[PDB]
Amino acid sequence: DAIEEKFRERLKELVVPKHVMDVVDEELSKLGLLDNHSSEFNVTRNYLDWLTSIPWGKYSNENLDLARAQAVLEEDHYGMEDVKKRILEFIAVSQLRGSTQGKILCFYGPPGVGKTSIARSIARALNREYFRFSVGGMTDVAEIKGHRRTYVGAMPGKIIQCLKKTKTENPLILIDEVDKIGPSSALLELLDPEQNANFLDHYLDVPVDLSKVLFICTANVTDTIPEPLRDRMEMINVSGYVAQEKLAIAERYLVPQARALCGLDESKAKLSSDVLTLLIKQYCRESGVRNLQKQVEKVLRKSAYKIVSGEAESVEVTPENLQDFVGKPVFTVERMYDVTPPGVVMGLAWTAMGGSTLFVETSLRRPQKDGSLEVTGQLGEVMKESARIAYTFARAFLMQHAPANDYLVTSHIHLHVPEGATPKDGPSAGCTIVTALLSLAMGRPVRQNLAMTGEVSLTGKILPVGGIKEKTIAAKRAGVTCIVLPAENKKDFYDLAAFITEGLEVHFVEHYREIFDIAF
């Protein structure tokens, strides 16, 4: 009949596996006896529509060439050397084996660093089809595994929809916000090399081969990703950008794209490098370039309005007239303390938004039985415990360094981290709290440009802390000249690029007794 011939013509060019062919044959035989007006006829027709639309034997012709792919990758993005190295290794492995292959990757980092744009660029370089869907906040398993034919509203799920859309068995599938998933049990089957080749969808009732599909996941923090799901995929860190990198991105990518978006041209609107530097250092505060893009778009919108209105035939943006386009600076103040009085020590922080600088303030609550420490600043339970440990160690250290100084054992002290409205957690501020307490007790301020991080033990040992790269970037942004780090983080600090640490006087410590000598 016409329907059977249509479905078979849909099926001519595919190299269908034997079991799928048997299923299609039996469903066609079933359709050959049902009446056209039957609802079961509708169900069978809808089923055969999906089975005859899966690209059982079609593969996209990849560009297995290192030079062209490297050119595309380095022309589409700046500074993503880890991701580019991984993709070049993928291409080399595909070329050496002489066949297409699939892998499961995961890009994690602060928002606005380019995790999705790099995935689109990778799909462009590999000549693979591109598809993406978001699992953030997802609570329904049935949108991946599908619903069986019995129910009226059954759908074969996102993976089968992607396979039908892309018409290839080796596309690039981006799963966005895997760390914000509510449902993960379907993903465990979806991306697992032992069972990718036999992924069974409830609607299809027939397995599809997903071994050649290149899965790329996106997240911001790895710890929130489910534990059995974090083990299947490979973690690649897409870290934030330093001011120089952001300036390079703005000059090379952001401004040229926003000019085309606004319809302007280079001769019509010119963005000086000083303007971009000012926008970076005073109109944005982030690890990515997400807000810088919006500021550039605002500047070019104002320029376009000026051109159309006839106020000027061409407009040049200058740090003298930048306020005409974006107003007054948003971040005029970079550091809370230019010079720190006794009792406050500057530290470093790391969050899902990247690295940041924090201060630890201490003061007396009562003039001149026991003493006590009050802690405020929306600090978490871990950081409250860190403050208790730091207070105990400060008492112990001051007992032996200055026996006559009964300040810590008798005085009542309040400790605050001035970012009162922002929740804070982590034990990395223990050494900073110890230093703040000791500086308050001795009445001596610490080195005026020193920053520090590191967990402290009850006996004073300094323990490694995470987020060294983001903390170093924040220190460089804040004008820190000397940074104190745990010795176990030496392997993490020297992995940094030279332009991130060219001006830092770095000290690596094992115990607080030498942090005391460094800071005092």
Ligand X SMILES: Nc1ncnc2c1ncn2[C@@H]1O[C@H](COP(=O)(O)OP(=O)(O)O)[C@@H](O)[C@H]1O
Catalytic residues: 428, 471
Residues 240-256, buried b or exposed e (16+ Cβ, 10 A)?
bbbeebbbebbeebbbe
User: In terms of CB distance, is 257 or 459 closer to ligand X?
Assistant: 257
Residue 78 binding target from ligand X, a second copy, Mg ion, none, CB below 5 to 8 Å by type: ligand X
Should residue 228 be labelled a site residue for a second copy when binding is judged by CB under 8 A? yes
Closer residue to Mg ion, CB minimum distance, 115 or 306:
115
Task: Calculate the CA 300 to chain-centre distance.
Answer: 28
Question: Where do runs of H (alpha helix) occur along 452-511?
Answer: 468-477, 490-493
Q: How far is it, in rounded angstroms, from Cα 388 to Cα 515?
A: 19
Tell me, residue by residue from 32 to 61, as one string, x for binding to a second copy by CB under 8 A and - for no binding.
-xxxxxxxx-x-------------------
Residues 293-352 that bind ligand X (CB under 6 A): 293
* Residue 463 interface partner, choices a second copy, ligand X, Mg ion, none, CB cut-off 5-8 Å depending on type: a second copy
- Which of Mg ion, a second copy, ligand X, none has residue 34 at its interface (CB below 5 to 8 Å by kind)? a second copy
Q: Is 113 known as a binding-site position?
A: yes
434 labeled part of a ligand binding site:
no
Instruction: Label the pairing between strands 354-364 and 344-351.
Output: antiparallel
Tell me the sheet residues that pair with 207: 200
Among 461, 496, 500, 518, binds a second copy (CB under 8 A): 461
Least distance to a second copy from the beta carbon of 301, Å?
Answer: 5
Q: Which of 170, 455, 469, 476 binds a second copy (CB under 8 A)?
A: 455
Query: CA torsion angle for 510, 512, 515, 519 (degrees, to 10)?
Result: 170
Q: Residues 341-380: x/- map of binding to ligand X (CB under 6 A)? A: ----------------------------------------
- Residue closer to a second copy by CB (options 116, 127) is 116
Binding partner of 293, given a second copy, Mg ion, ligand X, none, CB within 5-8 angstroms per partner class? ligand X
Interaction with Mg ion in 299-338: which residues (CB under 5 A)? Answer: none
Lay out the sheet containing 372-376: strands in order across. 372-376, 412-416, 354-364, 344-351, 450-452, 482-486, 505-509
Site for Mg ion contains 116 (CB under 5 A): yes
**Tokens standing for residue 444:** 């001596």
**Contact status, residue 188 vs residue 228, Cβ threshold 8 Å:** yes
- Cβ distance 82 to 236 under 8 Å? yes
Residue 270's binding partner among a second copy, Mg ion, ligand X, none (Cβ under 5 to 8 angstroms by kind) is none
**Please, which of residues 291-310 interact with a second copy by CB under 8 A?**
294, 301-302, 304-305, 307-309
**DSSP 8-state secondary structure symbol assigned to residue 225:** S
**Beta-sheet pairing, 214-219 with 172-176:** parallel
Round to whole Å and give the CA distance between 471 and 426: 14
Distances (CA, A) of 365 to 357, 372, 417: 26, 10, 16
Pick from 335, 332, 313, 314: nearest CA to 323: 332
**Binding pattern to a second copy, positions 64-83, x when CB under 8 A?**
--x-----------------
**Contact window for Mg ion (CB under 5 A) among 71-79, 116-124, 345-353, 397-405:** 116-124
Is the CB of 113 or the CB of 348 nearer to ligand X? 113
Could you say whether residue 253 binds ligand X (CB under 6 A)?
Answer: yes
Q: Phi, psi at residue 123, to the nearest 5°? A: -60, -40
Contact 255, 208 (CB under 8 A): no
Whichever of 49 and 273 has its CB closer to a second copy, that residue is: 49
Phi, psi of 450 (to 5 degrees): -90, 135
DSSP class of residue 171?
-
Applying CB under 5 A, the residues found at the interface with Mg ion are: 115-116
Would you list which residues are annotated within the binding site? 109-116
Would you list which residues are annotated within the binding site for ATP? 109-116
Applying CB under 6 A, the residues found at the interface with ligand X are: 77-80, 111-117, 249, 253, 288-290, 293
